[PDB]
Amino acid sequence: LDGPYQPTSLNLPVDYWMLIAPTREGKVAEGTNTTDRWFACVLVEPNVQNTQRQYVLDGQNVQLHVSNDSSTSWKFILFIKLTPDGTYTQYSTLSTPHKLCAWMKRDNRVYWYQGATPNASESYYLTINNDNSNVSSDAEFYLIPQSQTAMCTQYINNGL
């Protein structure tokens, strides 16, 4: 567990989980290959009835629909658009009272933990084909090597 790192932008090295620790509901982080994937994760607090919320994604205000029917778990939602003028679309969610999410660049992909703790797992990915894909995090984060995926899984499901 290398960190915390302060919010920043980076060419996230391949084969590291970026375990992100946001402070509260809102945008958490964005990333892109600049070609055909612009992705973002947002965090929704417990007890949110279906609604639109405004996020600044790719520099622009976007109204996205969110909900969280848990009274204890936060919900991370992973949104992806495929072109600059496209639509950010929900692909995956992670429900967790421990407030942590993680993604990793590996195998020409970005892997992402999804499901509901305490058996969330790294079962979603998108294809990026760009090992220099850039990530900008508004939150503190940690780096965990892929060799220690089992530990990242432990932290996702139980906190630090």
Ligand SMILES: CC(=O)N[C@H]1[C@@H](O[C@H]2[C@@H](O)[C@@H](CO)O[C@H](O)[C@@H]2O[C@@H]2O[C@@H](C)[C@@H](O)[C@@H](O)[C@@H]2O)O[C@H](CO)[C@H](O)[C@@H]1O
């Ligand atoms: C958004 C993105 O980059 N998608 C890739 C991705 O899509 C896969 C992947 O998300 C896995 C994760 O478990 O789930 C599916 O296999 C998904 O496949 C895509 O979506 C489904 C609904 C089908 O329409 C399928 O034909 C489609 O490929 O990886 C694939 C390669 O496996 C592509 O690279 C997508 O663009």
